[PDB]
Homo-oligomer: A and B are copies of this chain.
Amino acid sequence: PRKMERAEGPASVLAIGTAVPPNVVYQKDYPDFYFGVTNSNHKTELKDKFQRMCDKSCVSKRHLYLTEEILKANPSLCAYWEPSLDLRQDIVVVEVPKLGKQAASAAIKEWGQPKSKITHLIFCTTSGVDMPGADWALAKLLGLRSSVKRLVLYMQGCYGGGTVLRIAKDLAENNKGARVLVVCSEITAITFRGPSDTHLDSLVGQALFGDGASALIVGSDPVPAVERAWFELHWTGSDILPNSDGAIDGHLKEVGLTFHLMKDVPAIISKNIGGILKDALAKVFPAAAPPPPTYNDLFWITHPGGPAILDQVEDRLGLRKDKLASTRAVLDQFGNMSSATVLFIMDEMRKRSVEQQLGTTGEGHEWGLLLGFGPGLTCETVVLRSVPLV
């Protein structure tokens, strides 16, 4: 007999909550707001480039903690390269767990069980670092039991929504009764800065990144007629894509978090993703036996790093345009919320599936993929099973 009993069934998503800052910035307004608040309106050619980036972003609106009032009170955030980190940390070490608490409370409310039943916490963010960390802060805000087993995943970046599921799978499955609270919370105050015409890749982030937090309850063996599974975690993989050193770098500097991109992140992802998914599906559906579903028969929860990534993955895999509809809906209404985004998309998908009276929580499809992409270049792959509806 093991000294810690393990669970039997697959780790399952039992609830999803989300939260965003109340301030909404419409993309139509953003070039004028951003170049005005950063005192950059003399940079007319650069502003024209940024206008084109926003026009092509496939982002209609974003929720941002930062407001004009906060920016006017804190000029070091509006410069391109001024010492700020201490100010940025003072903000996000508080606001990242606070936003995470709102998402977690929503997940716990849906779950419907006492928060004392939570045994583990995973907190993922790319926004700030501290000791004790955002996991400790969230546990205190929520009133979790003092013996909850916590894990803080800092400086993860845009693949982190995959990472938290890959870790939560083993916590839930190897511990009988475990209920894992998973929180991803992202606030762009850590990276916001003024524009620079020698760093056009930093402008990309200004057009795409939004704020938000998402939370899950993950556990194996849901209690019948009490808990409800929405998705099951069945297979995980992680890959460093070949020839991708430096494709996406991010450094925590005295001026805050800075990013350095390569212009064909979309090419690197789209040229390698097919081989990764073919191998994953072959391992989940081995011949010896049902064949893998085809790509267009899966449901897709894909990190929308930018519209060009989505377009090129679509093209190379032969996806029909509607496969990424839920993904694009979140990008359109929230922007790129880094690690939190795929869980917003998971929530969007199950909600659309219920509303449209489809046969499963994954748009009627049995099997599906959650994909995160980020610094490395790292690709996180999670093979999911939906749950039948009514």
Q: Is A149 an interface residue (CB 8 A)?
A: yes
Pick the residue among B169, B173, B376 that contacts A132 (CB under 8 A).
B376
Instruction: Assess A252 versus B89: contact at CB under 8 Å? Given A154-B154, A375-B132, A375-B136.
Output: yes
Judging by beta carbons under 8 Å apart, are A6 and B147 in contact? Answer: no
What is the CA–CA distance of A283 and B132 in the complex, to the nearest angstrom? 28
What is the CA–CA distance of A2 and B7 in the complex, to the nearest angstrom? 12
What is the CA–CA distance of A139 and B238 in the complex, to the nearest angstrom? 13
Judging by beta carbons under 8 Å apart, are A167 and B151 in contact? Answer: yes
Judging by beta carbons under 8 Å apart, are A86 and B170 in contact? Answer: no
Judging by beta carbons under 8 Å apart, are B151 and A240 in contact? Answer: no
Binds B, one of A22-30, A102-110, A229-237: A229-237
What is the CA–CA distance of A5 and B151 in the complex, to the nearest angstrom? 24
What is the CA–CA distance of A238 and B163 in the complex, to the nearest angstrom? 22
Instruction: Assess A252 versus B129: contact at CB under 8 Å? Given A171-B170, A238-B149.
Output: yes
The closest CB in chain B to the CB of A139 belongs to: B240
| Centre residue among A129, A170, A245 by max chain B CB count within 10 A | A170
Chain B positions within 8 Å of A152 at CB level: 153-156
- Residues 268-284 (chain A) with a chain B CB within 8 angstroms: 283-284
Interface residues of A (CB under 8 A from B): 2-4, 6, 10, 83, 85-86, 89, 126, 129-133, 136, 139-140, 146-157, 163, 166-167, 169-171, 173-175, 234-242, 245, 248-254, 283-284, 374-376, 378, 383
What is the CA–CA distance of A257 and B6 in the complex, to the nearest angstrom? 39
Chain B positions within 8 Å of A147 at CB level: 237-240
What is the CA–CA distance of A374 and B130 in the complex, to the nearest angstrom? 13
Instruction: Assess A284 versus B146: contact at CB under 8 Å? Given A131-B155, A155-B130, A375-B136.
Output: no
Chain B positions within 8 Å of A136 at CB level: 240, 375-376, 378
Judging by beta carbons under 8 Å apart, are B175 and A163 in contact? Answer: no
Judging by beta carbons under 8 Å apart, are A383 and B86 in contact? Answer: no
- Shortest CB-to-CB span from A139 to chain B, Å, is 7
- Chain copies in complex: 2
Judging by beta carbons under 8 Å apart, are B170 and A235 in contact? Answer: no
Chain B positions within 8 Å of A156 at CB level: 131, 152
Judging by beta carbons under 8 Å apart, are A146 and B242 in contact? Answer: yes
Majority secondary structure of chain A interface residues (helix, strand, loop or mixed): mixed
Pick the residue among B4, B133, B237, B240 that contacts A234 (CB under 8 A).
B4
What is the CA–CA distance of A153 and B155 in the complex, to the nearest angstrom? 9
What is the CA–CA distance of A242 and B146 in the complex, to the nearest angstrom? 8
Judging by beta carbons under 8 Å apart, are A253 and B86 in contact? Answer: yes
What is the CA–CA distance of A291 and B239 in the complex, to the nearest angstrom? 46
A–B pairs, 5, beta carbons within 8 Å: A131-B155, A131-B248, A149-B237, A151-B153, A252-B252
The closest CB in chain B to the CB of A130 belongs to: B251
Judging by beta carbons under 8 Å apart, are A236 and B149 in contact? Answer: yes
- Shortest CB-to-CB span from A285 to chain B, Å, is 9
What is the CA–CA distance of A374 and B132 in the complex, to the nearest angstrom? 8
Judging by beta carbons under 8 Å apart, are B284 and A131 in contact? Answer: no
Chain B positions within 8 Å of A175 at CB level: 170
Chain B positions within 8 Å of A3 at CB level: 10, 234-235, 283-284, 383
What is the CA–CA distance of A235 and B6 in the complex, to the nearest angstrom? 12
Judging by beta carbons under 8 Å apart, are A254 and B2 in contact? Answer: no
Pick the residue among B140, B146, B163, B254 that contacts A86 (CB under 8 A).
B254
Chain B positions within 8 Å of A236 at CB level: 4, 149
Pick the residue among B129, B140, B174, B283 that contacts A129 (CB under 8 A).
B129
Instruction: Assess A250 versus B173: contact at CB under 8 Å? Given A139-B240, A155-B152, A163-B151.
Output: no
